[PDB]
Design a protein around this ligand. Structure first.
Ligand SMILES: CC[C@H](C(=O)Nc1cnncc1C)c1cccc(Cl)c1
Ligand SMILES: CC[C@H](C(=O)Nc1cnncc1C)c1cccc(Cl)c1
Lengths: 304, 304
């Protein structure tokens, strides 16, 4: 028992981190097979970032201008190309530490682990959710660009995020591994609106099931509700509307605990309307939305 | 910017995990050089755990009774010995993946990363603090015994914890790597009292400094206090008494922010006396005590 915001073991991803330098800019790259992926803004100077013309900036660069170092060893760059907001540097050596991997574009509300890196060196790992507004609330300083987000299924790493930018509001934006931004963001030093964010309702419900499994039960009540009634409350409190697809994914947790999904919705409704009255749930004094139903099942069953 | 409960990259520790089986019991072991360390209760059956005589139980075991498997490969056991509550199995092969390492006994209030494992396989990593009462609030299921806690200083892994037991209250207890329990716990299936726990005051203050650095400033006030006045409040709220040693370790954060330590104490005093009034600090609705002053500096500066 016990319930923690657990990240995936980062070993498989640590073996892929490299440092990429172009001119005076250094950031992180991801070396998989004979390709190194990194944010295309590695080719910009500080003055270029105000309004960069990436195609023109890349044209002044040759393979030898991209310095890629894997710890201590230097990689020989034999090709370069831009795909959306990422650069792909073809190298002459396949990474011997390349795990089995996939590139996946995750949905908002899904979770993943981030391996924060500086100068190609891993510094820490944490679990987070892609917000409904396609930002992430990470921990990133200058030099962290190119750090990646991922999930692990047994021996396969599904890379879903590459860090690119910190918005003026302190939240983070980045791309999938084909260089497509999540959300409306562009890789330019301009003020950019992240949408209104909402709380990931299905994740809060999953976490309430994790609380019951672990013995935190005070919030359970004698009430039930309907999806329509619940969604009026979700609306008022800026929670995502719950759908039957969300109820279906909560099925295993409902089965394990014997608490019907709409009954857990009535508990959530009362917590939204009354607050926690100074109590905690799984050591939190707010409703947690960074665990998906799959995360709860994995953690509560013991998946490696 | 952004502030997260970050764990160390677990790669160096993943390479040391093995599965250890003795009879019908399987748990995790730590393979460093030519020695595998694991909880001595691997030699117990369920009926033995009520009141085990470990010396007598170990005497019925030979080297060939300990099955150690590193992923797919089998290790040959050429020696076994008990040191306090850990078993040390000498193997004929040095782990090729042994990182630079130290065994350290941490102080209560210090933090570390745990790599939760099942059957020798890493499942997840999370950061936690050793409570003032020498328990940890982890996430551990049956089969997680032998999972370790550690810190990383550049290339050196300081192992500080090995998981042994879940108390009837759902909190966790374990040993240093010489097999000495942290706290009064014994490796026996008996109800055991964990002391009264307290909040790690110096860590909450460190986290309030991390909040100011990251822009969460609402809790700053026009007041100051003294160590004596503050400790009367710390007493009332079951916080650890603050000492000049704690003030000294907060010095770098006080210097970086320009907020004198006793002024931050007055902010903490008001938060203890008034609560958060429904506001949050770094996304938390309670006072967080799982970041040491060193953790805050490392995270806020970018240490790899
Ligand atoms: C030059 C990096 C900079 C940025 O926001 N990166 C950082 C990443 N994470 N935490 C802090 C910083 C400073 C940037 C400016 C404008 C657009 C883009 Cl794509 C990137
Ligand atoms: C046989 C393991 C058991 C235990 O508490 N382990 C577990 C560890 N973590 N989460 C759950 C469990 C079940 C145990 C009983 C009594 C003493 C000792 Cl040293 C260990």
């Amino acid at each position: 028992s016990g319930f923690r915001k657990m990240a995936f073991p980062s070993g498989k991803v640590e073996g892929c981190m490299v440092q990429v330098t172009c001119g005076t800019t250094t950031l992180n790259g991801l070396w998989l097979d004979d390709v190194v992926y990194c944010p295309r803004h590695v080719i910009c100077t500080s003055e270029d970032m105000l309004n960069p013309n990436y195609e023109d900036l890349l044209i002044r660069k040759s393979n030898h201008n991209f310095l890629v170092q894997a710890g201590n060893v230097q990689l020989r760059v034999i090709g370069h190309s831009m795909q959306n907001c990422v650069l792909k540097l073809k190298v002459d050596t396949a990474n011997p530490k390349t795990p089995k991997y996939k590139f996946v574009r995750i949905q908002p509300g899904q979770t993943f682990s981030v391996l924060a890196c500086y100068n190609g060196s891993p510094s820490g790992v944490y679990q987070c959710a892609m917000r409904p507004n396609f930002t992430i609330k990470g921990s990133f300083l200058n030099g962290s660009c190119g750090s990646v987000g991922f999930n692990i299924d047994y021996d396969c790493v599904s890379f879903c995020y590459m860090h690119h930018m910190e918005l003026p509001t302190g939240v983070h934006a980045g791309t999938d591994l084909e260089g497509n931004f999540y959300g409306p963001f562009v890789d330019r030093q301009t003020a950019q609106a992240a949408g209104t964010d909402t709380t990931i309702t299905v994740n809060v419900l999953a976490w309430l099931y994790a609380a019951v499994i672990n013995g935190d039960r005070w919030f359970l009540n004698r009430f039930t509700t309907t999806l329509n009634d619940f969604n009026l409350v979700a609306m008022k409190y800026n929670y995502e509307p719950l759908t039957q697809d969300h109820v279906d994914i909560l099925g295993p947790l409902s089965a394990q605990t014997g608490i019907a999904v709409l009954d857990m919705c009535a508990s959530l409704k009362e917590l939204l309307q009354n607050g926690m009255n100074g109590r905690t749930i799984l050591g939190s004094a707010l409703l947690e939305d960074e665990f998906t139903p799959f995360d709860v099942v994995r953690q509560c069953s013991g998946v490696t």
